[PDB]
């Protein structure tokens, strides 16, 4: 075996081409961001939520 595929059919665990050591693949921060703010007539303060 060289590399495996998850349920999404993507490379999630690949070994080195020569070394027997195996490294898992986990994506880093890629999620969405939302902004919570009141109406513009009241104020302009905003909140950052992930």
């Amino acid at each position: 075996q060289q590399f495996g595929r998850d349920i999404a059919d993507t490379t999630d665990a690949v070994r080195d081409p020569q070394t027997l050591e195996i490294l898992d693949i986990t994506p880093c921060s890629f999620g969405g961001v939302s902004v919570i703010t009141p109406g513009t007539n009241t104020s302009n303060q905003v909140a950052v939520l992930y």
């Binding site: 999404a8 993507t10 994506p27 999620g31 969405g32």
Partner: peptide, 22 residues
């Protein structure tokens, strides 16, 4: 939670994500 609600809870088992309910 009542034991009935416990029984009902125990009897139920890449871009897309699941937002938790309010």
């Amino acid at each position: 939670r009542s034991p009935i609600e416990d029984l009902l809870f125990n009897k139920v088992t890449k871009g897309l994500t699941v937002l938790p309910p309010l």
